[PDB]
């Protein structure tokens, strides 16, 4: 990845072996889990596209989903090529002819070519753009991973409040919805998908109370509430 | 976070993957433990909001607790904007414009501009207030987790003094109240929750005996309040 | 190996000891997997023959595969020497005496003179061609471990679409044949070996379906055709 | 080792503990197995006699075997005073003097002096010969391979082709004979030590077949060779 | 300890937790073995007395030998004081009062004082004198550690040659006597206490020869030797 | 070499098959050195081992004549 600042101009240096192996181990046990999307951003320091392509090409046994992500990245590349300012093709001598949609990715451009417009000309943030296109494909994969749909989720009569809340919040991560819509859904969904025992104390707490306040009261009641022999 | 000073100007540096693994791993083993709250503060050198939001967003199973913490952060941010000193509307020419409560949060703010208000014009301690709000949310989380009260922690007939004192102090970590008030209560609580036979040594020392003095006496009697080594 | 640019002339830095440990460890967990082939190139910091050769010599288990790869390299080196433009007679003093097939290889070359022709004079791709030949040999090695052929990829009466897709993707990584033909083949191969119930729901999608469109349809169906039972 | 050139004259840098750990681990996992020799060579960067001798001295349980290696190093050293130039006795003031066979090792040399003839006046190849002497002695440790011979390797009735190949390549590294002799012998050996069931298809494939061709062909043959019915 | 030279004069910088763990792990799993003496030498980078004393006091459960080691060092410090006393007492102003016999120990000398006489004036390697005494104590300790005397080296009837030669050379690690003595007993002892079957082979090999030849002859024979007699 | 087969019958078999070896002289010399020890029966292999490294056919034949039969049946007690 591109590194170095204090010791002068940026230099692309190789990915550390430990980081590559550590990433593979995370992928084994957190294969399609929503937690991977912020982890990927944190781990991938230095915006070089070749390294990002290398990370997606080194995936093991359960790789299949990653080729859909690559096809999605190509759709975004096609969007850059034709649905954004297209360009003539020929350029006036003295300019590096500027990247095409597929040149953003590893498909038609090499490491030396990409690095050239990242430091020998005013920077083009190709790695940020390529990474953003990867994140857009990752949103689809986490959405498809999801086991049960929100209307088919319901709290059992032998199911605690802790688990019911945990099932909802874990499932909510894969939705890909906006904050305003998520807040609207959350307010009624808790009452709507509840069991009768939980609903008995929840309706008593009722509208107005925020997440923490409802949770504080509900945790105090405990388990699946009424008569669950918790004392 | 933004680092460097001895080497010249400050630069925003991405967090280590080792630090991220250590955070994920302690969350995997000690998920809701009170030991996490001092540990998080010690780990988080440079409280830059974007990086802090990423650490919360990379948490596994207990997403519901994290979202309750996020609502607490929104509640504190809203409180800062409305109830803590207000800042004027139309900013003066050539100034960076002081952030509002919403701008403190990584969720509703962008990095380049955020680095600018934290490095150009006079210091704004946005990281420290954001960290304090996170610590307050963590204090709320240990309260949700706790299954028993400090009045319910009591020594069994065959349970050692060592086992009892450990439970009492582990439980005490999440009891949040005034130190002067806690001290005043504690003298009764230590004798109150001990088993009858083992309570005898605590009673024998009487008024003015501190935990060191009690522990020193407890070296001789040993175990669950045993008959002494020499009769 | 040879790396450094902005901070001065290139220096032949030795490989990390972790790289040696990781190389043995990856072989221990997954010796014949195709995922090792891109991973090997990510650990290459200057493709200098002598240190790249050390990786081949440190393998234990599947020694026969490595020895076969070495036999293949001898043929590729000979192909460069004889089937590609032949090397002329005696040269004058002060020249680097143009590399032949066995000079590119570590077997008849010395490291000091190898570095000399490689980069003391304008760069020559001696390490790059050697690295590329190794990838060609690695393709043969992973291709001899796969039991099932493309016609033997089937779906049972109780096998879900996701497992069938996973087997197809695992097989896709073992292809080693023309990409354009393979893509154009992929369009009809999946529906061919699908059982009537599976085939019937797949037939509804029709010609020219994209990978995302196909996966979206597959995600909806899930099971071994549309409507599960006893599993 | 002594390193640095572009950043100033070379300085002695102590070897990292992880290098010794890798050497000990290799010995722990597979004591005298052939993998140790390139691992030792890989970690012998710089090649200063004192630094190289640390690995020889750090071996635990198997240090008695290393006494023979130490004897071999002294045998090669005795030869440096005999088969190689004997030099002369009176070397006049102002020289670092071309060392004797016994001066190569740390036993008769002081580190400052040893480093002195490696960079103060034109470098002496002390590390090159010392590293080679250790490799030559390690190349005699192959003799210690208890109950291991090519003549004992005969494939059983229910033993797969891959087991036979594994056994053949395991003892192949212990041959210690010339490459031409190995090739001439190899043609007979491959068919000779095979079981009758797998030998039958090798006979059908017949003369003029290379190692790659035979190994590639045998993938589709399966197990100990195609099994018949019990009727 | 004192480290580096590239940035300027050496800096007193504490050891890595990884380095500290390596020392604890080696001592816990290999105790007081002769292999720990070169390991300690390689794990003690930078000759600062305080840090060397700290290494001895940070050892795990088995510290009895460590206390004896410090006691033997204390006697050596007393020997050093009386060995050099000509400069004892008053000196001309501008001299750092110099290290006396007890000041070689980190316990008697303050840290700023240690660093001052190490790094300002022409180097006095006080930590290397302290380490020489530690190595001397370790040399005493291995003799105590040895579970057998050299007079009790013998081979049982079902005991193999590999164990007998290994025991003899392992014992020679702790003998302390000059290398001539070790060579001298090797010439005559081996045929004396070998088991009847092995003893016949050693006797039959007869006068002269070297360990490589003896080892080679012993390897063909195998195990505790053939049961039947020869001539 | 068989159980009751002596060195003379065995060496004759080896030289008979070595006539049709059809390989380089250098390879034949390398094989010649180790084949007699490798293919000898346990009892008769002992003299070949006893002579050890650097042996010549003249020395080996001298030794083989003196040990006789299909090898002496080695004592234990």
From Swiss-Prot, chain F:
Subcellular locations according to the entry: Virion
Region described as Dimerization/Multimerization of capsid protein p24: 1-77
Function according to Swiss-Prot or TrEMBL: Forms the conical core that encapsulates the genomic RNA-nucleocapsid complex in the virion. Most core are conical, with only 7% tubular. The core is constituted by capsid protein hexamer subunits. The core is disassembled soon after virion entry. The capsid promotes immune invasion by cloaking viral DNA from CGAS detection. Host restriction factors such as TRIM5-alpha or TRIMCyp bind retroviral capsids and cause premature capsid disassembly, leading to blocks in reverse transcription. Capsid restriction by TRIM5 is one of the factors which restricts HIV-1 to the human species.
Transmembrane portions of the chain: none
Cysteine-cysteine disulfides: none
PTMs per UniProt: Phosphorylated possibly by host MAPK1; this phosphorylation is necessary for Pin1-mediated virion uncoating.
Organism the protein comes from: Human immunodeficiency virus type 1 group M subtype B (isolate NY5) (HIV-1)
UniProt subunit comment: Homodimer; the homodimer further multimerizes as homohexamers or homopentamers. Interacts with host NUP98. Interacts with host PPIA/CYPA; this interaction stabilizes the capsid. Interacts with host NUP153. Interacts with host PDZD8; this interaction stabilizes the capsid. Interacts with host TRIM5; this interaction destabilizes the capsid. Interacts with host CPSF6. Interacts with host NONO; the interaction is weak.
Name of the protein in question: Capsid protein p24
Superkingdom of origin: Viruses
Signal peptide (from-to): none
């Amino acid at each position: 990845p591109i590194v170095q600042n204090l010791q002068g101009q940026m230099v692309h240096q190789a990915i550390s072996p430990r980081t590559l192996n550590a990433w593979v181990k995370v992928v084994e046990e957190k294969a399609f889990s929503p937690e991977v999307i912020p982890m990927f951003s944190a781990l991938s320091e230095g915006a070089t596209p070749q390294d990002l392509n290398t990370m997606l090409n080194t995936v093991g046994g359960h790789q299949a989903a990653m080729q859909m992500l690559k096809e999605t990245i190509n759709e975004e590349a096609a969007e850059w090529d034709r649905l954004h300012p297209v360009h003539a093709g020929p350029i006036a001598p003295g300019q590096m002819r500027e990247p095409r949609g597929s040149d953003i990715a590893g498909t038609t451009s090499t490491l030396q070519e990409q690095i050239g417009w990242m430091t020998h000309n005013p920077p083009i943030p190709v790695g940020e753009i390529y990474k953003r296109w990867i994140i857009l494909g990752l949103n689809k994969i986490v959405r498809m991973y999801s086991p049960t749909s929100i209307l088919d989720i319901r709290q059992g009569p032998k199911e605690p409040f802790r688990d019911y809340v945990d099932r909802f919040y874990k499932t909510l991560r894969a939705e890909q919805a906006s904050q305003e819509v998520k807040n609207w859904m959350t307010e009624t969904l808790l009452v709507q998908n509840a069991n009768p025992d939980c609903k008995t104390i929840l309706k008593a707490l009722g509208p107005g109370a925020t997440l923490e306040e409802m949770m504080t009261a509900c945790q105090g009641v405990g388990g699946p509430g009424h008569k669950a022999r918790v004392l």
